[PDB]
């Protein structure tokens, strides 16, 4: 039984083993703010280079979407490859991943993320924690980014956890419209009208519906793409000044280049920047949870509030009913065996029978190199049941 | 022809003069390509309380029927189909059941050295598996990969129960020459009746706490544990009642 | 109780249209509360360095939202209702002097203190494709009182702007000064919790 | 439509998040506000009936629909039970490239999807694309200035 | 019927984007109904003065 | 409603949340019964009534 403890300690613990799902998810991310046509050229080259290898049969792409963060960022495209078959293909999914990774490290023009599809849907992986740094002071997301980055820089040194990533990004370029209200009121304009003109020309303005094939379809107003592509597209836009005079839009408006976050995130009615991380090897998920909580408390104090989601929230709010139920089951088994044998002492033999089955299972799983799994525990359940059944008959 | 303004002349300024009108998409941010060819993916979420295999087959046939009427150059494909995984798992569970039954017949023909005895597992095991299916359906559980894995597990419980009952009958039959088959069976059943109930209750009490565990891992555990408990209880009842008579 | 609430909301949905614009703008809340106070929680500042309005705003931002997530709490509210709100205290003597009415103030605040929609610069369909796609971000909702007093109601015949500061006094005050919560001899916002039905 | 991420967050997510707060058995709330769109996922406690969660969310959002801006009110908020997995994905492609993506999407939406809804067991049928036929008026600023 | 109305309302909620704007402005109402006519009550003025 | 009562025009951003903007006259002017003698409303013409 001491060797059982040793073998349990040495064996790795993971939630679900990685399995080839017969397709390979490719995540392509161009630099932030890259145009869609560049992404289409990239994914065209991607599929062309993936065509040579015989293992993939077909390629499905979804240009203009980010699978990681549901969105329509034009700089991100997801291209799922379809493996030929499990039987007709000599290579496993991992070797295909390695070949595609090796083809694509050199160019560094289109970032490559080749990941096998999740065994089961909505499955948290490696028991990572989902921290939300709810800013409570109302600071700008740009300052939130620097504070959170200081938090990660502190957290990287911590031994409990490793591989921390933050979804919040502010690299995306964003023109900032600075409105000189004095000039716009001077020209006898209204902010609502000038912004309707902007939304009509640069943006898409949706006015009414027109029917085709019996279905009610939108009517959209936008300026020709030739004119709005340039940064100084305001000067061609003209707005009436309520005095029957054409006032140029660039007179009171100006585009200045700035960097802003493409996607914002609010957790529990409060602005936040989601932080993910995985426990370091040899450390439990909960230990990493308190470690990152302490890091957040040190870095951010009384201005950011910690939050938990998914697996981290389940661990934080866990009532520990599983261990209590296991203790109840152990007591019930003891009682039922004592009733069967008409003696309190003898069920001890039936209980001590199961360590042999547990020892065999853990020894073989250690030798095989397979890590502790959910399916391993499911098999251990039947193992304990059968060992107990054999012992009960021997004792009786 | 929408009239933006009316000039001093009878001629009217219209949208055609200042803008170009065409039927375009609402959004140009996205685009889908399959094999370097323009495509539109379609997603089909399975309705709750339905059969995946039948729905997938109906979808494929309906797609073929619609493809008969497709415009020239339009072709369909189904890259992802979770029905493949469940069909493979069902085939593998059937093969595992057949192999386990054949191995039971072989092992009992080897040790027990009797041919008429092989029939007893052949009836006892399928009855208990069918009962497990029925009680699983009553509880509302659904066939899935986890359930099929737990069925692979429960195969061992059922075959083992049949082995214990039949082997005890044979051992008592060979202990005494004077004893009759019915008397040997009743003696063995008297010996191991309360033990079998004890194993059934013990295994249920072992499996129950696993179901109480919360979380996604808790629910995954609950599936295996609950079908395992259902199977062991029904197999115990079958070995208690049907197996001795056939023995 | 849940089914009763769902039926009540289903029947109410039709009548919401006939309600006045202000009523629906504030919104109609349908809950399962019994309107019987389950308990009263009073948050009081011992050091008295925190004013009643700021205590109420702290509570409504931090405590009340978390309390409403607690199961079994049908509705939780604070007596004061002294939420943060820009108060434009108009002076009628100064309003009639400059010849601007309260309607001219409402229109100015509605038009200027708002955020509208601005499209991205480089977007398809474009025949001259730019290397990058740039979004446009604006801020039309003023944050500080100094920005609110600079709102231009009217432009004089010369290049002189009449502004809210001339005709009104702007400050950050409570939404309502109607109520007050007192604990013992101290000032504390009381949190009344109504038990959810069943 | 055509609103940057921050304004969408502040103007749309905040009222909806305020109104949705306090819904029965809600563990936490996650919302993202990408350019032009605002998705708000409202997670609930395990064992809660999904239809019940959906209808309560509907009621809470219908309470605060009026506070939303004019464009968001025009394009009403959609509430769905996101707890769904993908049975399969059917891709309709024009091999000869006779039709562009817009025509393919419109044909699929008008013809293919309705038959998919007819297939028993197909609870949800959707198309990834977002290209509905729309009447586009391409304004030319030079011509607009020429005609005043 | 209580859950049937819930399912119908949830589906209309999910498809709200597909609806035309007018029926979005005038909220669509989902209510349980019964085709059965339990009885017909007729109110009449005996004096015919009403 | 903008002078005697409180008129809620729209919301301003503060501390992440949205807080109302309310317009009202000073407490002194709406205090008396004869409050109406002080408020003036402009007609279709430029005259103040
Ligand atoms: C949107 C449109 C997409 O739907 C999703 O976003 C779903 C709901 C993802 O979960 C959503 C879940 C969500 C919303 O959770 C907050 C978010 O994380 C993203 C969008 O994935 C799932 C499971 C993806 O796994 C996800 O792949 C991502 C690259 C990373 C993500 N995880 C590591 C983070 C992982 O789970 C997965 C199985 O590959 C997608 C498969 C079904 C597809 O190929 C299909 C075509 C999708 O692209 C999609 C229907 O177009």
Read off the tokens for E26.
């005038």
How far is Cα B183 from Cα C70, in angstroms, rounded to an integer? 66
Cα separation, C82 vs F19, whole angstroms:
11
Tokens 């797609």: give the residue. Answer: B63
Beta strands in A159-199 (DSSP E): 161-166, 173-179
**Which candidate from D92, D120, D143 shows the least CB-CB separation from B39?**
D92
Please tell me the distance between residue B49's alpha carbon and the centre of ligand 1 in angstroms. 24
- Contact state of F13 with D15 under an 8 Å Cβ cutoff: no
- CB atoms under 10 Å from CB of B149, counted, come to 19
A363 lines ligand 1 (CB under 6 A): no
Distance from CA of F47 to the nearest CA of C (A): 9
Whether A165 contacts A182, CB under 8 Å: no
Chain A hits for B192, CB-CB cut-off 8 Å, are: 393, 396
Which chains have 3+ CB pairs within 8 A of B?
A: A, C, D
As a dihedral over the C-alpha atoms of residue D135, residue D140, residue D143, residue D144, rounded to 10 degrees, the angle is 80
E3 CB neighbour count, 10 Å cutoff: 12
Strand, coil or helix: what is C175?
coil
Backbone torsion region of residue A336, taken as left when φ is above 0, otherwise alpha when ψ lies between -120 and 50, otherwise beta: alpha
Q: B50 vs B79, B147, B150, B212, D121, CA distance in Å?
A: 22, 16, 21, 27, 5
Q: Provide the chain D residues 106-145 that lie in CB contact (below 8 A) with chain B.
A: 107-108, 111-113, 115-116, 118-140, 143-144
How remote is the C-alpha of C156 from its chain's centroid?
32
A43 close to A63: Cβ distance less than 8 angstroms: yes
Q: Counting one residue from C and one from E, how many pairs have CB atoms under 8 Å apart? A: 15
CA–CA–CA angle D4, F18, C87 (5° rounding): 125
Mapped to the 3 state alphabet, what secondary structure does chain B carry? Answer: CCEEEECCCCCEEEHHHHEEEEEEECCCCCEEEECCEEEEEEEEEECCCCCHHHHHHHHHHHHHHHHHCCCCCEEEEEEEECHHHHHHHHHHHHHHHHHHHHHHHHHHHHHCCCCHHHHHHHHHHHHHHHHHHHHHHHCCCCCCHHHHHHHHHHHHHHHHHHHHHHHHHHHHHHHCCCCCHHHHHHHHHHHHHHHHHHHHHHHHHHHHHHHHCCCHHHHHHHHHHHHHHHHHHHHHHHHHHHHHHHC
**In angstroms, rounded to a whole number, what is the distance separating the alpha carbons of residues B130 and B234?**
10
* A217 at interface of D, judged by CB pairs closer than 8 A: yes
Burial class (CB in 10 A: 0-12, 13-18, 19+), B245: exposed
Q: Give Cβ neighbours of residue D6 (< 8 Å, ≥ 6 apart).
A: A141, A260, A261, A264, C137, D33
Gap from CA of A219 to ligand 1 centroid (Å) = 31
What residues contact A298, with CB distance under 8 A and at least 6 apart?
A154
At a CB cut-off of 8 Å and minimum separation 6, what does C150 contact? Answer: A181, C163, C164, C165
Q: How far, in Å, from the CA of D21 to the mean position of ligand 1?
A: 26
Question: Does ligand 1 have an atom closer than 6 angstroms to the CB of A97?
Answer: no
CA A39 from chain centre, in angstroms, equals 22
Q: Which residue of C has its CA nearest to D25?
A: C71
Query: Which of A175, A166, A178, A177 has the alpha carbon at shortest distance from A141?
Result: A166
Query: Residue A79 forms beta bridges with which residues?
Result: A26, A61
Compute the distance between CA of residue C6 and CA of residue C29 in angstroms, rounded to an integer. Answer: 12
- Name the β-bridge partners of A372: A13
Pick the residue whose CA is nearest to atom 35 on ligand 1: A68
Question: Residue A68 C-alpha to ligand 1 middle, in angstroms?
Answer: 6
CA distances from B220 to A325, A378, C175, D25 (A): 16, 9, 51, 22
Give one DSSP letter per residue of D15-82, joined into a string: HHHHHHTT-TTEEEEEEEE-TT--EEEEEE-TT--HHHHHHHHHHHHHHHGGGS-HHHHHS-------
DSSP string, F2-49: -SSS-EEEEEEEETTEEEEEEEEE-TTTTTSSTTTTT---B-SSS-B-
**Cβ-nearest to D91 among B34, B50, B219:** B34
Question: CB A269 to CB F17 under 8 A?
Answer: yes
Q: Give the DSSP letter string of C142-164.
A: --SHHHHTT-EEEE-SSS-EEEH
CB contact under 8 A, C14 and E29: yes
Measured between CA atoms, the residue of chain A closest to residue E19 is A216
Question: SS3 for A267?
Answer: strand
User: What's the distance, CA D140 to chain centroid?
Assistant: 31
Q: Find out whether the peptide bond into E47 is cis, omega within 30 degrees of 0.
A: no
Q: What angle do CA A52, A56, A62 make, to 5 degrees?
A: 100
Distance CA B17, CA D143 (A): 8
- DSSP code at position A240: E
Q: For the packed helices B216-246 and A374-395, what is the interaxial angle rounded to 10 degrees? A: 40
Structure-token pair, residue C160:
């002189």
Cβ within 8 Å of residue D25, ≥6 positions away = C71, D44, D45, D48, D53
Nearest CA in chain A to B24: A220
Percent composition of chain D: helix, strand, coil (DSSP 3-state, to 5): 45, 25, 30
Give the three-state DSSP class for A372: strand
Atom number of ligand 1 nearest to Cα D30: 16
Euclidean distance between CA atoms A379 and A376, whole angstroms: 5
Among candidate residues B156, B19, F14, D44, the one with its CA nearest the CA of residue C145 = F14
A113 lines ligand 1 (CB under 6 A): no
- Structure-block tokens of residue B179: 């004893």
Pairing outcome for strands D133-139 and A215-223: parallel
Cα dihedral A222, A224, A226, A231 in deg (nearest 10):
-30
Is the Cβ pair B24, C124 closer than 8 Å? no
Which atom of ligand 1 is the closest one to the Cα of A121? Answer: 23
Which residues in chain A precede a discontinuity of more than 2.5 Å between C and N? none
Calpha distance F11→F18 (Å, rounded): 6
Give the integer Cα–Cα distance in Å for C170 and C144.
Answer: 10
Q: How far is CA B201 from the centre of its chain?
A: 26
- Cβ contact, residue pair D18, A269, below 8 Å: yes
* Dihedral pair phi/psi, residue A254, rounded to 5°: -150, 135
Q: Give A13 Cα–ligand 1 centroid separation in angstroms.
A: 25
Residue C125 with chain B: CB contacts under 8 Å: 24, 28
SS3 C85: strand
Task: Assess whether chains E and B touch, using the rule of 3 or more C-beta pairs within 8 angstroms.
Answer: no
How close D3 gets to chain E, by Cα (Å)? Answer: 19
Q: What is the spatial distance between Cα C149 and Cα C152, in angstroms, rounded to a whole number?
A: 8
Q: Give the angle A143-A268-C52 at the CA atoms, nearest 5°.
A: 80
Q: Is A16 in the pocket of ligand 1 (CB under 6 A)?
A: no
From the CA of A248, how far away is ligand 1's center (Å)?
Answer: 45
Distance CA C127, CA C133 (A): 14
Report the atom number in ligand 1 closest to the C-alpha of D128.
51
* Contact residues, chain B to chain C, C-beta under 8 Å: 24, 28-29
* Vertex D51: Cα angle to D47 and D55 (nearest 5): 120
- Decide if D140 and A217 are in contact by the 8 Å CB cutoff: no
CA dihedral A383, A386, A389, A394 (to 10 degrees): -90
Contacts of C134 (CB under 8 A, 6+ apart): A33, A173, A174, A175, A231, A257, C120, C121, C122
D86 CB near ligand 1 (under 6 Å)? yes
Nearest residue to A129 (alpha-carbon basis) of A154, A155, A103:
A155
Contact at 8 Å (CB) between C176 and C182?
no
Compute chain C's Rg from CA coordinates: 23
Strand, helix or coil at A279? Answer: strand
DSSP states of A101-120 as a string? HHHSTTT-SSEEEEEEPPSS
The secondary element (H helix, E strand) that includes residue C66 is: helix C64-69
- For A61, which of B33, B195, B203 is closest by C-beta distance? B33
How far off is chain D from E36, nearest CA to CA, in Å? 28
**Residue A27 Cβ contacting ligand 1 at under 6 Å:** yes
Q: Does F27 touch chain A (CB under 8 A)?
A: no
Contact A7, A369 (CB under 8 A): no
Reported structure resolution in angstroms:
3.4
Residue pair B184/B172 in contact by the 8 Å Cβ criterion? yes
What CA–CA distance (Å, rounded) separates D80 from D54? 7
Instruction: Give how far Cα F29 sits from Cα of C93, C165, C166, F13, F22, Å.
Output: 9, 18, 17, 30, 17
Helix (H, G, I), strand (E, B) or coil at E36: coil
User: What gap in Å lies between CA A132 and CA A130, rounded to an integer?
Assistant: 7
Ligand 1 atom with least separation from CA of A125: 33
Q: Is the dihedral of CA F22, F23, F29, F34 positive or negative?
A: negative
Measured between CB atoms, does D55 come within 8 Å of chain C? yes
Nearest CA to ligand 1 atom 48: A67
Helix/strand/coil for C40: strand
Handedness of CA E9, E13, E19, E21 (dihedral sign): positive
Q: Is D97 on the interface with E (CB under 8 A)?
A: no
Of residues F12, B201, B8, C131, the one with CA closest to residue A230: C131
> Is E19's Cβ below 8 Å from some Cβ in D?
yes
Q: Which of A181, A202, A268 sits opposite C136 (nearest CB)?
A: A202
User: For residue C187, what are its two tokens?
Assistant: 């000032």
Q: Which residues pair with D139 in a beta bridge?
A: A223, B19
Cβ-defined contact of A191 to C116 (cutoff 8 Å):
yes
Task: Tell me which of A25, A58, A59, A67 to substitute to probe ligand 1's pocket, judged by most ligand atoms within 8 Å of the beta carbon.
Answer: A67
- The answer to whether residue A142 neighbours chain E at the CB level (below 8 Å) is no
A67 Cβ inside 6 Å of ligand 1: yes
Phi, psi of A173 (to 5 degrees): -70, 145
Q: Are D13 and D40 in contact (CB under 8 A)?
A: yes
**What approach was used to elucidate this structure?**
cryo-EM
Exposure b/e, A150-183, CB count within 10 A at least 16 = b:
ebbeebeebebbeebebebebebbbbbbebebee
Contact (Cβ atoms closer than 8 angstroms) between residue A131 and residue A307: yes
CB B26 within 8 A of CB A220: yes
Chains that touch E (3 or more CB pairs under 8 A): A, C, D
- Nearest CB to B56; choose among D46, D87, D101: D87
Instruction: Please state whether at least 3 CB pairs lie below 8 Å between chains C and F.
Output: yes
The answer to whether the Cβ–Cβ distance between D11 and C16 falls below 8 Å is no
Ligand 1 in reach of A117 Cβ (< 6 A):
yes
Query: What is the number of alpha carbons within 13 Å of residue C71 lying toward its C-beta?
Result: 9
**Is the shortest distance between the CB of A118 and ligand 1 below 6 Å?**
yes
Using alpha carbons, list the distances in angstroms from residue A361 to A2, A368, C123.
15, 11, 60
Q: Is B238 exposed, middle or buried (0-12, 13-18, 19+ CB in 10 A)?
A: buried
């Amino acid at each position: 039984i001491g060797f059982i403890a040793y073998l349990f300690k040495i064996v790795p613990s993971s939630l679900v083993p990685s399995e080839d799902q017969g397709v390979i998810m490719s995540i392509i991310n161009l630099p932030s703010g890259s145009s869609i046509h560049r992404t289409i050229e990239e994914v065209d080259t991607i599929n062309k280079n993936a065509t040579q290898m015989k293992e993939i049969s077909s390629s499905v792409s979804l240009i203009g979407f980010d699978l990681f963060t549901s969105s329509l960022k034009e700089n991100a495209a997801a291209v799922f490859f379809i493996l030929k078959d499990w039987s007709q293909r000599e290579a496993s999914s991992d070797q295909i991943i390695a070949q595609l990774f090796g083809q694509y490290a050199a160019d560094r023009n289109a970032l490559s993320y080749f990941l096998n599809l999740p065994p089961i849907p909505g499955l948290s992986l490696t028991g990572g924690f989902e921290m939300y740094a709810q800013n409570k002071s109302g600071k700008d997301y740009d300052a939130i980014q620097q504070d959170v980055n200081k938090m990660l820089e502190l957290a990287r040194t911590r031994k409990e956890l490793a591989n921390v990533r933050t979804t919040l990004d502010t690299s995306f370029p964003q023109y900032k419209l600075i409105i000189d209200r004095d000039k716009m009121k001077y020209y006898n304009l209204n902010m609502q009208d000038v912004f309707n003109t902007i939304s009509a020309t640069i943006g898409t303005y949706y006015v009414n519906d027109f029917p085709m094939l019996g279905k009610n379809f939108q009517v959209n107003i936008r300026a020709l793409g030739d004119f709005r592509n340039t940064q100084d597209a305001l000067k061609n836009i003209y707005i009436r000044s309520s005095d029957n005079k054409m006032i140029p839009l660039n007179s009171f408006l100006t585009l200045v280049r700035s960097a802003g976050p493409d996607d914002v995130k609010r957790f529990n009615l409060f602005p936040a920047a989601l932080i993910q991380g995985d426990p370091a090897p040899g450390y439990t998920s909960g230990q990493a949870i308190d470690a990152i909580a302490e890091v957040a408390k040190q870095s951010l104090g009384d201005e950011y509030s910690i939050a938990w989601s998914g697996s981290a929230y389940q661990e934080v709010s866990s009532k520990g009913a599983g261990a209590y139920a296991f203790v109840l089951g152990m007591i019930f088994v003891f009682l039922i065996l004592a009733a069967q044998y008409e003696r309190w002492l003898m069920p001890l033999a039936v209980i001590t029978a199961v360590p042999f089955a547990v020892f065999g299972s853990i020894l073989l799983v250690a030798l095989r190199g397979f890590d502790n799994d959910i399916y391993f525990q499911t098999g251990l359940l039947l193992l304990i049941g059968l060992s107990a059944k054999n012992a009960i008959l021997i004792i009786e | 022809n929408i009239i933006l303004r009316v000039n001093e002349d009878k001629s009217f300024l219209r949208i055609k003069d200042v803008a170009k009108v065409e039927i375009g998409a609402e959004q140009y941010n996205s685009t889908g390509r399959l094999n370097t060819s323009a495509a539109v993916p379609i997603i089909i979420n399975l309705q709750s309380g339905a059969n995946a295999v039948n729905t997938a087959k109906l979808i494929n046939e309906k797609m073929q029927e619609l493809s008969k009427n497709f415009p020239q150059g339009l072709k369909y494909q189904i890259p992802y189909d979770t029905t493949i995984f469940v069909k493979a798992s069902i085939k593998e569970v059937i093969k595992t059941f057949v192999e386990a039954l054949a191995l039971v017949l072989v092992v009992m023909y080897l040790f027990l050295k009797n041919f008429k005895s092989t029939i007893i597992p052949m009836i006892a095991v399928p009855v208990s598996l069918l009962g497990t299916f029925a009680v699983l359906y009553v509880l509302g559980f659904s066939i899935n990969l986890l359930t099929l894995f737990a069925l692979v597990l429960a195969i061992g419980i059922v075959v083992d129960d049949a082995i214990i009952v039949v082997e005890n009958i044979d051992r008592i039959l060979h202990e005494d020459s004077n004893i009759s088959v019915k008397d040997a069976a009743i003696k063995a059943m008297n010996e191991v009746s309360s033990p079998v109930i004890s194993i059934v209750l013990v295994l249920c009490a072992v499996f129950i706490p696993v179901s109480f565990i919360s979380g996604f891992v808790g629910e995954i555990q609950r599936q295996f544990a609950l079908t395992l408990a259902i199977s062991v209880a029904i197999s115990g009842f079958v070995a208690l009642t049907l197996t001795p008579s056939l023995s | 109780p849940d089914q009763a609430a769902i039926d009540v909301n289903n029947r109410i949905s039709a009548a919401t249209a006939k309600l006045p614009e202000a009523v629906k703008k504030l919104g109609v809340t349908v809950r399962k509360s019994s309107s019987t106070i389950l308990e009263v929680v009073s948050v009081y500042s011992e050091d008295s360095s925190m004013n009643d309005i700021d205590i109420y705003n702290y509570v409504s931002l931090n405590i009340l939202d978390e309390l409403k997530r607690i199961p079994g709490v049908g509705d939780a509210s604070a007596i004061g209702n002294k939420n943060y709100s820009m108060r434009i205290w108009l002076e009628p003597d100064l309003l009639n002097k400059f010849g601007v009415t309260a309607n001219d103030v409402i229109n100015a605040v509605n038009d200027q203190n708002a955020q509208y929609a601005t499209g991205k610069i480089g977007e398809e369909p474009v025949v001259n494709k730019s290397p990058q796609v740039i979004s446009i971000t604006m801020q039309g909702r003023l944050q500080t009182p100094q920005e609110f007093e600079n709102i231009i109601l009217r432009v004089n015949e010369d290049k002189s702007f009449l502004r809210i500061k001339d005709v009104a006094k702007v400050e950050i005050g409570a939404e309502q000064y109607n109520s007050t919560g007192r604990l013992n001899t101290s000032a504390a916002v009381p949190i009344i919790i109504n038990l959810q039905s069943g | 439509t055509g609103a940057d991420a921050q304004t969408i967050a502040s103007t749309v997510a905040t009222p909806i998040e305020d109104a949705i707060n306090g819904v029965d058995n809600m563990i936490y709330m996650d919302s993202t506000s990408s350019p032009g769109q605002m998705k708000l996922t409202v997670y609930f406690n395990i064992g809660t009936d999904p239809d019940q969660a959906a209808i309560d969310v509907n009621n809470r959002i219908s309470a605060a629909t009026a506070k939303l801006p004019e464009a968001v009110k025009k394009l009403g908020v959609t509430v769905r039970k996101s707890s769904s997995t993908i049975l399969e994905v059917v891709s309709v492609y024009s091999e000869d490239s006779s039709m562009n993506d817009i025509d393919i999407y419109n044909y699929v939406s008008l013809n293919i999807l309705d038959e998919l809804k007819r297939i028993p067991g197909v609870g949800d049928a959707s198309a990834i694309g977002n290209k509905n036929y729309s009447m586009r008026i391409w304004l030319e600023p030079d011509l607009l200035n020429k005609f005043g």
